[PDB]
Amino acid sequence: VCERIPDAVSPELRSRALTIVVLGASGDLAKKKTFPALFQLYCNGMLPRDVNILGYARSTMEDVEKWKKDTLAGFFTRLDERGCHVGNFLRRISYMTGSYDRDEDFARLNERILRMEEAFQGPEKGGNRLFYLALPPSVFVGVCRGLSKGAMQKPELGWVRLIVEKPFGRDTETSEQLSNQLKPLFNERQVFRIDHYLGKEMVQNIIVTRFANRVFSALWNSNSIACVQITFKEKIGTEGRGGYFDSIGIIRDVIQNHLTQILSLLTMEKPRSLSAEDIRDEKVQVLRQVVPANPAECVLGQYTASADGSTPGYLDDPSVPKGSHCPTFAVLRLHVNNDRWHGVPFIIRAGKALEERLLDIRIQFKDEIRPFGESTQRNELVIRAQPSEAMYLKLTAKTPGLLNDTHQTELDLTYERRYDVTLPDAYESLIHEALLGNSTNFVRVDELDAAWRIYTPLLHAIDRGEVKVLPYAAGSCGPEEAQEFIRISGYKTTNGNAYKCS
Amino acid sequence: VCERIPDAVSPELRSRALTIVVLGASGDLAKKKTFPALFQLYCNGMLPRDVNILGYARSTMEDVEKWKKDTLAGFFTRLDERGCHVGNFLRRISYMTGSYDRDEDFARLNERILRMEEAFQGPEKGGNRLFYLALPPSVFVGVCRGLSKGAMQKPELGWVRLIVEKPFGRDTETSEQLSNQLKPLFNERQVFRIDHYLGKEMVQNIIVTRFANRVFSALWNSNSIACVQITFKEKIGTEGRGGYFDSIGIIRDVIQNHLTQILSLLTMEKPRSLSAEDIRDEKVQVLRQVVPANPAECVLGQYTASADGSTPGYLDDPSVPKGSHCPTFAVLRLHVNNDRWHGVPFIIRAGKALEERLLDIRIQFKDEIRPFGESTQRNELVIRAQPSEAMYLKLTAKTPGLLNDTHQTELDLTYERRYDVTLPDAYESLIHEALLGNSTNFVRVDELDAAWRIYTPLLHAIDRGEVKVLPYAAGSCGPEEAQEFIRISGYKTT
Amino acid sequence: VCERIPDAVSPELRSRALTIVVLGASGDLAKKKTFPALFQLYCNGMLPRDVNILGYARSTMEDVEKWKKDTLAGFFTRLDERGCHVGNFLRRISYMTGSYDRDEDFARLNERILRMEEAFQGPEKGGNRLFYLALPPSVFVGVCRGLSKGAMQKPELGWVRLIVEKPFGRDTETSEQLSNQLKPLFNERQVFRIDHYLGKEMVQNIIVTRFANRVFSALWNSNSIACVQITFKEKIGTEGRGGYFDSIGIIRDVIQNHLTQILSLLTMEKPRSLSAEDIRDEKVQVLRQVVPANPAECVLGQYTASADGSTPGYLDDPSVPKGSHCPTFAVLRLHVNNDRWHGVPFIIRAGKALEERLLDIRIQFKDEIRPFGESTQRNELVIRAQPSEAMYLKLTAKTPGLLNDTHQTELDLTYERRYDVTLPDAYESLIHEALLGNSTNFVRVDELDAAWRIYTPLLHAIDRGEVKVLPYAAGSCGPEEAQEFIRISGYKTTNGNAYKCS
Amino acid sequence: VCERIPDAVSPELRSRALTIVVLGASGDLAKKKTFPALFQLYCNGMLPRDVNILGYARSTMEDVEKWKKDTLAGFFTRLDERGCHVGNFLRRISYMTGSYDRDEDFARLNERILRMEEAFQGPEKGGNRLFYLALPPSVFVGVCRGLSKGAMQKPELGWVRLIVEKPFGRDTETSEQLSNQLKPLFNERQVFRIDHYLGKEMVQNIIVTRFANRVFSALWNSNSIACVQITFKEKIGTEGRGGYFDSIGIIRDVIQNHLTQILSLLTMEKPRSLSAEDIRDEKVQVLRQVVPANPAECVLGQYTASADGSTPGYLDDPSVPKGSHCPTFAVLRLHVNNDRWHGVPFIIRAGKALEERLLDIRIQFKDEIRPFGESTQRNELVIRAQPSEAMYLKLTAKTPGLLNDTHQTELDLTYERRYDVTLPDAYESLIHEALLGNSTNFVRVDELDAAWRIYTPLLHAIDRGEVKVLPYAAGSCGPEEAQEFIRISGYKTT
């Protein structure tokens, strides 16, 4: 039962050759997310039938075909809808052992690209290159310098694009210098600094729901909005890779990158055009007006063992350094300093080993005092990006029936209920958009700095030991102090119920 | 299934006696809507156990109990849950034959009433009297004068309330006269001028959805709203009851009353309080600012026989006068002259023998020009009061999937899907509210005036033969000219 | 150059007789404000030439004509245009000695009015009666009961109207009692509770400037207005009449009556019609939404002796009780609890023995953050009701000349510069409006209650000794704590007005 | 009086030499506006003491010094304060006779320029070169190609800037060609396209008054503004030189440039920053949304002799081609297609030989219907850029006195009454801003395009003879049809 592959290959891609180099092909991200996404884009018939996926990792691969069919293929998802195509697809993937420091190996990479670029039977004799750098931050600049030297495409004979994965430094100084390190190496246009939250279905609709509809457009200002809440929740802890996380922390890992992006699209002014840079310009413009996070206006947590004992404590990890104070949870109150968001509190929440898995945006409107008084409560527009993709506006309506009373209700749109479409993984969209050359869903340098500049002073205060990191039971709602702070920060509504929650 | 009726009748009605007189009990409205609604209020245990429903009509009855069990009872609805209660309920209804002009017959209705509240075993002496006047407009003032003479309750011994059914005159001059005819007879507080749309579940939420929510409150003005459309659609025509209709017409029958009612609620400013008098004050205030309908800003229709022939032509009715020009369909463009509704077009639609049964309100917001251009289209808040009571906001969203495209969608709330509750008939709410003394869902005299003053000049122009009445096939969408006029009036197809 | 008397007398006042009884005619208010205003209305040709002004006081005066020509007439103002008319006018005023408690003295009042109405050369045989009660609060109910008994006009022969003066109780309980005391005596329609601020030129334009202009109408809400300041300033102290003031205080004397009035017209929603009760209904409606003044949100003062010795201390008055803590100055922060004024601070200021004489309203708009930043500052619409009647909108504009800099400026309208008209005294308008039957510029009972209910809890706290009364030099800007509180309350702009002020 | 000139010349202009070449020094513009503005900037001590103004022209002078003190100097204005400085100033101006096409004369210009900066006694080597091209459009590209070849400052030895005067083509195609003709010759940064309207005191405050004030910011949208009127009025006609105007017309001469400029500033969204390009980006962005002027939505005029006869007819000029139909007057209704200006009419007026001299902007707000009705009328914010520099907001207030009546009033600010400062001529600011390198008050190439694209279809229709050109008496208000059109266009004559 497998759906056929139509020709959705964009006309640009089906004239010149194609080579998708996955640098760090053995690595966890590439096995789990990159290669699987490439399979789905192939199945969609969005990649040319004669595409060349080249795996460039350090691993001394004995049987490539076994790793391809057993390891790699084990991660492909729709198989009751596209299982037969696994064979034809895998035939396009080739592996190549090599180092991220020896120029002889990058030359050996240029060598292999051309040997498989020359084999193209199409109209243009050039060849296009997309390099996915899913490699450690420890070797990043090496590979960038190596690829820019001897792995580039001849002029008027194709494009070179680079998908740069995170981390992007620990702070603004760290990131700034890395951004300087790439300036000679590549033109910004070639760089595609990937944030995957810009590939999530609900995250993409932020710009449409906000600038296609007069209903939301007229309400998106300080006069109508009383509070804005961005929430990240994860049932899982670090559990295995706690050693890795210790050096990053909840703010650097999710808040600085993923949720500041949510924040940029939520707060930005209407773009001049729907152009990539026109959209990107407004994103940076608004983060340039975000006041840097102050330590007194935040709550930090670190998870301890669950009541059941099934989830262990954060520190109860051998990889986690003894006596660590790394925050696994954070709640922040941010302020956008412009005539649109003046006064409006921005409550950003993020935590691991919590009560539920959740990604949602909450635009809480002003309370309508008269004529309903206590019979009513703040309306809020809720956009849940995961688990069930949905958008719902919470209102106050008359209790249906033979009675003169009120009740809170929803004007819901549940994606799983209303659409028979099997929505793509964030990475399918991004990789595809990068092949097309759409720099919109990719972090711009200035946009990235604008983001680092918000958290760097807070991050430093935290690292200097100035900010207290409260303990909370794994699987609970989080520290008590946080829910109180959220109330003080300006958020209301009695819709926060678990056994723990209130 | 059959379960015990609870004694949840409001404590006001608990102390003294109760008598609900249905004048014109033989009549079509009473047997189809009044009596059935009274059964449901009894089953809810909202009426006292010992309530007295008295039928009073010109009709002579051989077997009242047969008419009660066969005619009357045949109209009761929930019978898979409430079927057993039909017996106990019917036991409360009594009938009496009488003229609507002979004072003796009135002295006879009162005597029955005296004796009923004389049999009460409760805390207070005397009784409460609610009179439902579901009788022709031809005998109305006769009964009002008669009841006010010898059928009233002595002071400090109970209340008398009058549920006055429509029609309320043929125009503003006719209605004025009638209201003056009732001024000495009864105090306005006693009068309960009934418009049944005010009892519809979705029509009631108009005030809450507008003034409890900041989302709709901030948008309810000329700056955000591009057009407002009130739609009445009926699959059925005049049928046998066409002679009666000829003298009334679609404007007088539905637009003037029911739809101007929705219009008042939709346009009114936030009430000072949620008080009866505070809510109604704003209703009149806004109809006082509605510009009277001009003949050039309207389209009229009259149905022809259907393609199948199953629905005969309007004119093909023996009761319908030869060569009549009575409109069975009307579309109007109204203008509210205040700084909230300045410019905003108000498209009111109403017609019989159309393509579907429909009652909906459409609040069409301004088109958001840039950056989406043609990739987007006017948002609309849609409140459908019937068939399926639902509220949905139409919106533009990204085509779900691996696409950079748009699609129109909505944010639904379908009352049938979301609530397990068997919603009441408009008349259950109204009759109940009238027993409690809630004058909110009842037309006020100035409110009635304010309404008549909108349509009277248009109605007269029509009756003078100044306005053309276009023909349309029964069961069709209506005349072509109407859809074109709606486009010109400011409404955008979607 | 004596401006002749035109027949601009309203048609109602023509047909039936007219009798204006001034109860307490010897009293300070009557001789200083009432009688002078009646002269000006006579001169304007607004009162019938055959009008009857009857002075009913306790004083046992010998030469009435001397008191008329020397005392009374000495207070008349325009005499370089209207000086000749003093004679003809004074001929209409007559005096009567009599108690405020003996009914025989009231019957004797009825008796004289009857003789006057019996001398009327006009169409109707009855006569109209306007009673100006400018008498102590100590005898008020006595006169009301006496007039209602035997001083009323026969049915279908003329109207009776009562101009009632301040004070209207000590608090809400005191006022309630008094209003109930008058309920059987007179119909509210007959009662004309006088507040003279509704008689001031700028105070009257509050309703026009707000509901005739789209410019101000669109801005009169929480989204555009950042703060509202009502200011009362008086260069003079209690001087001799410190005894009279000790029992009243600055809140009861000006904040409760005069400035809550200014406040009602500033905050009210657009009236249904321009009708008297349609206007009055919105006034009552908005004061019903004012949250009662809390003691922690206020500053109180009591004037000390001035540096120059010219103004002695408040307590340095023989009439002022020893060790009295009566506030001569008050600043409070009020909150209107409705969707229009939600969040908007209302700073009400009032004080005697201050730096300047001033009555002004300040509608301070939100600060426009970008693109001008510190180069700009909050715009504020200023309506000054006295000294110079003016209305001016403060705005930021480019420094005129060969410069790229900013400067604050005003779009002024000065009534003495622009209009070259001799504006009437507050009391001319009011007395005239009362003869016509315009209850608009008169306090309604619910409008009086709604006002008392704001200050009664604060007033009580003050009288219980719970609120601190700070000392301040006579002729200074007031206590230091007050200016700081105003800043904290939400009021801005760098007004370095005096040596003291900043 | 006569006091010392201070050395307040900007520190950038201090280090390196300065040469201001006025190409077309004989010309009417230079002798009347350029040279006089140069004198005032010198008197201000805004130009270095050792500045070099070089007049380059085809004309020949026997006595340059006579033309300098008698012709040139006769046009200098403040002489009761600055009259003594005429000498010292004139001592900086030098002249040269040269063709605007022969390369020898361009080598000969450069020759002078190097030698002048060779004589500089300051810190930096080389010198800065500002070229004011006040020459016919007939020789423009010839001088641009000639200057770009020869008289160019060597790199790292100073800047070269070009103040290019109008006209900028006669349509979008004409202008496009010309802009492409300059693309290789100079970088846009060097080009300074002058529209002197941008130097007028009130035109400059357009950006401050609408983005520094919350009062005007909150009102600057379709919800509050009912109509916007831009007016240019001139008491004088074409006079002696008309044939020259015949090829241009009122739309190309004033509207397309000057008034579309005001229009851009009035309609633009709040700039990202106060940067030169941040400001210029919003200007182009809004003209990119202006719908092109349609012929049916405009009125054209051509002045006829005055009743007095003092002003002769437009055609009664020998230079004016026989049977011409050139518009000397135009009134247009423009539409900005964005969610800020949706529906708002933009009435642009412009005419020569009219009743008065006038430049004003009129922002007419919506009429406030209730509770005042006819007792009130539309508020209007009026900015008058000439004759008397003033800004006044028109509003309704209670008739002062013993009255319950209304009257129209204004919250004036008259710059002549409020400030004792002798405001500079548009050209002083511009020339100064160009020496500093502030590209804000200068037309951008895309700005120029965006402007041309509005009027080019209308202009062509006019030139094809498709649009009627009505006659009007010189010195009158203009054609009757125009005032009627303005009323229909949405302007409610307050």
Ligand SMILES: O=P(O)(O)OC[C@H]1O[C@@H](O)[C@H](O)[C@@H](O)[C@@H]1O
């Ligand atoms: O919307 P509803 O419940 O069908 O009510 C509309 C009814 O309105 C009444 O006025 C008419 O007599 C009916 O013919 C019509 O059907």
Ligand SMILES: O=P(O)(O)OC[C@H]1O[C@@H](O)[C@H](O)[C@@H](O)[C@@H]1O
């Ligand atoms: O400077 P003013 O008086 O406002 O006039 C602007 C003038 O500017 C000139 O550049 C135009 O050629 C004229 O047509 C126009 O009249």
Ligand SMILES: [Cl-]
């Ligand atoms: Cl900043």
Ligand SMILES: [Cl-]
């Ligand atoms: Cl629900």
Ligand SMILES: [Cl-]
């Ligand atoms: Cl759904």
Ligand SMILES: [Cl-]
């Ligand atoms: Cl730091």
Ligand SMILES: [Cl-]
């Ligand atoms: Cl018609």
Ligand SMILES: [Cl-]
């Ligand atoms: Cl319309």
Ligand SMILES: [Cl-]
């Ligand atoms: Cl149904």
Ligand SMILES: [Cl-]
């Ligand atoms: Cl639903």
Ligand SMILES: [Cl-]
């Ligand atoms: Cl039904």
Ligand SMILES: [Cl-]
């Ligand atoms: Cl008529």
Ligand SMILES: [Cl-]
């Ligand atoms: Cl309340």
Ligand SMILES: [Cl-]
């Ligand atoms: Cl004064």
Ligand SMILES: [Cl-]
């Ligand atoms: Cl000033």
Ligand SMILES: [Cl-]
């Ligand atoms: Cl001034």
